[PDB]
Design a binder for this molecule. Structure first.
Ligand SMILES: COc1c(NC(=O)Nc2ccc(-c3ccc(CN4CCOCC4)nc3)c3ccccc23)cc(C(C)(C)C)cc1NS(C)(=O)=O
Length: 330
């Protein structure tokens, strides 16, 4: 067992191994990992076991993070707790490599080259293909959840920019039966923003969001309309598509034609018709980076726990097991 030390950061108590030094708030903390000389990000979970909902969420994140092993996806470098036993186990600390900045603090400087956009979007899709192959959906893809380094290398993460502006319409209409391309829609909005410099759908409330969206991708067609069980929902989406339509070409004039073609494939109202991460990676827009032999999928992920209703203490023990069973990668 390592030797921990306490400290208070912004009225917040932090107890971590001496290994991590110079903690700095960024709850998350940036630190210097003495074992490697590299800067890392340390995330302390709020009140992990305060409720059954928190407990399961805590477990959910540890398991998922313990399984993520992809260049373009946040990975777990270390996980610890000051508690010497399950009895006193009450805090969880997770560690990952510290990244330079968000995709938000990188667009507030100047419009990126089309080549720069190709590379960034390619990495998002490469990461997304991986996460999707583990039967996992992000649901909150946006610039603030994208970490990029000095080498323009990207990693996808989730902080527990406007979510809604990158949110898929079927989610704001509460159609509950979301498919993975819900993330592809977000990617489309992101890519649009990187190419034009501006937020594609800058809505106030979600209603305004929906309206802006439908005026661009068009009124729901017959084919999509038949898959909507609810009649009030069927009518509602139609009521929201009463604004003077707009076209793609127009909104992305100037951009690489390959780029606008891909956007027309991501920004499709009917989620069943959106291109997938895998297909997208093979799009000619990415001819320059695409490699069928270096776009890995994930090992089968066991999330049978999701369909479980257990007591807090059960979730807490399972989580504790995961903490002690952690073995750092090479
Ligand atoms: C919320 O839990 C999830 C996490 N966890 C997660 O993202 N956790 C973390 C998110 C963010 C930082 C972080 C914070 C700040 C900085 C430093 N910033 C970098 C940018 O510049 C400013 C400073 N760097 C990293 C972390 C650091 C250490 C450990 C975990 C961290 C990841 C994922 C995907 C694999 C699908 C993406 C899904 C969920 N969802 S789930 C399992 O619940 O379903």
């Amino acid at each position: 067992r390592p030797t921990f030390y306490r400290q208070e950061l912004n009225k917040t108590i932090w107890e971590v191994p001496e290994r991590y030094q110079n903690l700095s708030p960024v709850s998350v903390c940036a630190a210097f990992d003495t074992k490697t000389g590299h800067r890392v990000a340390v995330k302390k979970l709020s009140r992990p076991f305060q409720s059954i909902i928190h407990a399961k969420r805590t477990y959910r994140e540890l398991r998922l993070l313990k399984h993520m092993k992809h260049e373009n996806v946040i990975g777990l470098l270390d996980v610890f707790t000051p508690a010497r036993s399950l009895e006193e186990f009450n805090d969880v600390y997770l560690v990952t490599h510290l990244m330079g900045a968000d995709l938000n603090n990188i667009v507030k400087c100047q419009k990126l080259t089309d080549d720069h956009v190709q590379f960034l979007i390619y990495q998002i899709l490469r990461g997304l293909k991986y996460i999707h192959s583990a039967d996992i959906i992000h649901r909150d893809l946006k610039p603030s959840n994208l970490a990029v380094n000095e080498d323009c290398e990207l990693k996808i993460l989730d902080f527990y920019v406007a979510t809604r502006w990158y949110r898929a319409p079927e989610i704001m209409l509460n159609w509950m039966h979301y498919n993975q391309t819900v993330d592809i829609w977000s990617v489309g909005c992101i890519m649009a923003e990187l190419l034009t410099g501006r937020t594609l759908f800058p809505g106030t409330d979600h209603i305004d969001q929906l309206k802006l969206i439908l005026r661009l991708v068009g009124t729901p067609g017959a084919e999509l309309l038949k898959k909507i069980s609810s009649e009030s929902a069927r009518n509602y989406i139609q009521s929201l598509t009463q604004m003077p339509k707009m076209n793609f070409a127009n909104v992305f004039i100037g951009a690489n034609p390959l780029a606008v073609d891909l956007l027309e494939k991501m920004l499709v109202l009917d989620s069943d018709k959106r291109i997938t991460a895998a297909q997208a990676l093979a799009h000619a827009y990415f001819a320059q980076y695409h490699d069928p032999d270096d776009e890995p999928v994930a090992d089968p992920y066991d999330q049978s726990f999701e369909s479980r209703d257990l007591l807090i203490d059960e979730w807490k023990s399972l989580t504790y097991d995961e903490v002690i069973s952690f073995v750092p990668p090479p």
